[PDB]
RNA sequence: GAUGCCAGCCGUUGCGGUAAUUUCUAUGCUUUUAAAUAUUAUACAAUUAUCAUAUUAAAUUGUUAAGUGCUGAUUUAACCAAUAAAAAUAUAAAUAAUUUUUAUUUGUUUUUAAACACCAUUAGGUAUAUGCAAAUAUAAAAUUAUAGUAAUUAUAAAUUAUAUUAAAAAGGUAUUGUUGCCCACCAAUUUUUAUAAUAAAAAUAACGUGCAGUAAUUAAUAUAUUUAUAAAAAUAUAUUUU
């Protein structure tokens, strides 16, 4: 997945450590996981990629001035096609819909 | 001598563990139609899958 | 911290430099510990059990004019019944490893009679020798009773062992008769007791006793000998105290520990005021019966 | 993470497995171990896609559950 | 010789890295070390550190055995009683009238019957310490991790069915009615994992 | 040794010269000298540390790499 | 449904601990401040008073309605007291968010000061003289391990 | 002899708290004698090695189940709404070795007008494998760190008083040891930089909310949905480093 399961190395101990990984280590990188949890839904992380893109080069749609959270900062220049695309599309996934597969809807969607 | 039942039931038992045959069947089940577990019962696996289904 | 400070006592004429250095400690975070021992003059060579390094003529002299050891330690023992001394368990208990000392050989011994499946015929000078060789090097301390039971059931003896041993025996575990007086030979031609009939005793007795236990004949390898963990000499197998076996029983006053003392006890180390609260001393009565 | 210690830790029971990995396995499915004496088309015995080991009740007549039946040894 | 080999006059012997280095081990194995039981994780009978282990697990059910404090009935002053449903039903305490006589006659063999048990349990333990106690020097088996590689067999097979990909993955819970509502085109009995 | 640029001394340029605490158990007020230095045409700075002395006044500072002192981060002192 | 804490405090809990409570009196819920470990009347005062100008000034933000009733200060105890507006009946017809003034503040810190004085006890806890070290990092000055200039 | 946590030594554990054999000086002393110091090159494993580079594998769908009398204190610890009775069946059987490197593939699924459950709360949503989505099952070169930041970190059995036996079995992130440690947000600082509300990471020793981990006050650990003053929690999975 594009994500990444394990951010760090929680497996590390002697070779041999009867065990994925011991509970120390393990509560260390869940800590990492937290702050970087945290802050991708706090400062309402959003990413994006599209079909015909360079689809390892990201799309920053958290960093759109239609959809920035910051005001000093300025987020990325996009195409506007796909800007009027990827925006709609998060307006989009601020409801889910009955009468489809459900999805799970966050307030930090929005 | 046979520890996980190979030999329970008797070769009998199994022609006559069938569908139409609650009489046999509910002479491996508890007082209630469980099974009664292997380690308790130790069956035949044949047995098991006859007398499951 | 209103921090403590200690000035190392250095040694003097009075106060010498080992008792200053035991007795005293000038790091206060082991203050009011507890009471340490140790062993000197004749505790030491009793606790570790370090035979004298012998010589000729002067420690042959004090070897020779020993005598027989287990009576005059039995003499030391009973003694303590005249007038001017005390029965005591110290002497009991020289007693009590001065005829234990052939431990070793005799649980061997018997082991060897009887958790041996066929061990050849024993009365034959072969095993016979093997028998001599081996209980010689388990008393003599040369050998382990382990490594010596191994070298016993893997010394050599007839060729076609098997096929031998099919033709006289069903399930191939023999008579232990020839095992056992083989045993008592062996204890007997060595000189391992002082008095004969010893040897044959508790080769005997040992054995009668474990007969009465279930599976008497089948033996833990790991316990079964010496090891690094071993049992209880209670629960030992071919051992002496396995008929001691019992276990102690306490009424405990509503103050039972804080009269440890009070009782008729015997004081190896006498209490003095300074650890003593009130206590008078193991002979004093207050509460006295009279009689002629 | 933190990227020093915090702890004073000093356990001080260093299992036999934990050095010397090159001979003993603590992963579950590898305590097969290193069977070359098989027949199996490997000597990694863990990696026999063929005859998965029954672990508690097979033994009694081998040795381990580990160790090849003895009528295919 | 005239000890044993497995202590020294200063604890129990060091034989490896681990006795020298963490030496409290060789002088300390519980609130009822003793100098005679040094090392030996089952220390005499009664004290603190004594239950034998029978592979690895330790032994605390002894008595709940012989059926003393476990499954008491002893029966013999029990059918007593329960035959004299007249001094069972009188006021039930008293040397009554006849059959308290009896009641005691069958207790009378109640006790030494429960001596002799209590002996036989006691010369249990004192056996099964000689002849089977690992002495907890071997790892437990009372739990369902310790059979970790048993758990490891039957999901390496599953796997292979899972053409050696879900390794420990398993079918995903469906519902009550999942394979009697759900509509038509969806798979209604849960699938292997690897199928999804 | 980043800093350093591979050569076995390399000399930089004072700035300021200010006092940082070292890493415990040890104590101290441990002289932490800000320095710069141009080099391959970007310009750089570099905290580096002192065991020299000073008598005259001179931005000529020889920093040669050492290894770790109870500072953490100093990784450059002086000749 | 009481909210105490102690006395030092940063603007950070002023700010999300009035948030906390007046969000609670957004739930209906009943609504107390005190502080019991303070070093003196006058501090407790002054974080009572700093919580509830955080607080008000999150409410008008927050359209709440909710009223004060009393402010029980003691020797041992600086509390205030809030009840909110329920239905939106009594909150139109009360659009008020109402909290104590000015006058209140200094007349119940006086009394407070009048109890202390019979009781003659200022503090129920006291900062101490006793610093823990600190170290200053990036400084133009020499530094003692806790803090203070070498001179 | 001075210095007194400071100044300084620092290859290095660490030293320096008024007697420092760990600084400065003096003095001796010491050496195996091209001097001292600074930066670099200087020889994995292969028989067993747990987080994200697979492949010889038998499997896929089966229409079953549960419902009307009556007058009402069930559920849980405490509340809260306000009908609740319920979902079992099938074996042989698919050959192995050879270049699928996008191909396929590893637990979010349609519908209550049909429910349990869960979440929010009296006034609802959600209520469980048709897209989408590689990912534990190890091919390996020391921790951290987006592959530039400090000099490491993880680890297991020693040691720790009460769970109705005829008194009996138990753990530690501490290392005289729970009045023990750590933990996060919360202030300045610093230093490098792939600067998403307020960027990320490395070091550190304030204040403050707490008490989040050491089987630890509703057991912990990995994955994921949601939640949020922070350590985290509800939930759904596995798993015992419980």
Known sequence: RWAAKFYGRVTFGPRNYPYPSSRWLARRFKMKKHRIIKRFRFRRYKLAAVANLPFAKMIRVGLLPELKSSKTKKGDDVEADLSGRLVSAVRSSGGKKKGNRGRPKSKYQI | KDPQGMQRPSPEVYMKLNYKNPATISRFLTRTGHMYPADILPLNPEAVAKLRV | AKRRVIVPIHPTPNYPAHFIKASFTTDPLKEKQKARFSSGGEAMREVQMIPKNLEGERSRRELMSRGDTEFEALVEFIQGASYDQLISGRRFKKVYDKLSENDDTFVWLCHTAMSVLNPGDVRSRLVYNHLRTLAEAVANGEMTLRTAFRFYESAVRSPAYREIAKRQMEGGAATRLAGISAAADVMRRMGLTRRPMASYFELYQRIVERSEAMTPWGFPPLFQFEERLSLEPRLKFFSRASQQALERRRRGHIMSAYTTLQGRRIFWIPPTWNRAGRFLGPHVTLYPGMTP | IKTLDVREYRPLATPIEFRFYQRYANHPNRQSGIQFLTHYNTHQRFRVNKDYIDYMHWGKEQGQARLPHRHQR | ?196 | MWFLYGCCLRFVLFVLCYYMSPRLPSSGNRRVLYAVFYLYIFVWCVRCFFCGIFILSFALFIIEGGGFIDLPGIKYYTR | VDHSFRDVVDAHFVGWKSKKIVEDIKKRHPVKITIKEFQSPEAAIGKIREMCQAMQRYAEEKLIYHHFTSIVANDREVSVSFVPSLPSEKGNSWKHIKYPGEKEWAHANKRMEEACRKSGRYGTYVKNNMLKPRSLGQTFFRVDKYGRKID
């Open chain 5, 1 to 196: 010789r005239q000890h044993d080999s497995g202590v020294n006059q200063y604890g129990l012997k060091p034989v490896n890295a681990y006795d020298f280095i963490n030496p409290t081990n060789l002088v300390n194995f519980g609130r009822g070390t003793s100098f005679d039981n040094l090392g030996v994780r089952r220390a005499g009978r009664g004290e603190i550190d004594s239950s034998p282990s029978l592979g690895g697990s330790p032994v605390f059910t002894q008595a709940k055995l012989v059926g003393l404090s476990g499954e008491e009935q002893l029966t013999m002053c029990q059918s007593e009683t329960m035959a004299l449903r007249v001094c069972m039903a009188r006021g039930g305490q008293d040397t009554c009238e006849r059959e308290s006589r009896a009641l005691d006659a069958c207790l009378s063999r109640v006790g030494h019957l429960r001596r002799a048990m209590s002996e036989a349990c006691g010369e249990f333990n004192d056996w099964f310490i000689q002849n089977v106690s690992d002495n907890h020097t071997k790892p437990f088996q009372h739990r369902p991790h310790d059979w970790r590689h048993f758990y490891a067999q039957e999901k390496l097979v599953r796997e292979r069915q899972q053409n050696g990909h879900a390794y420990g993955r398993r079918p995903k819970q469906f519902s009550f009615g999942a394979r009697y509502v759900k509509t038509e085109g969806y798979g209604k009995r849960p699938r292997l994992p690897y199928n999804k």
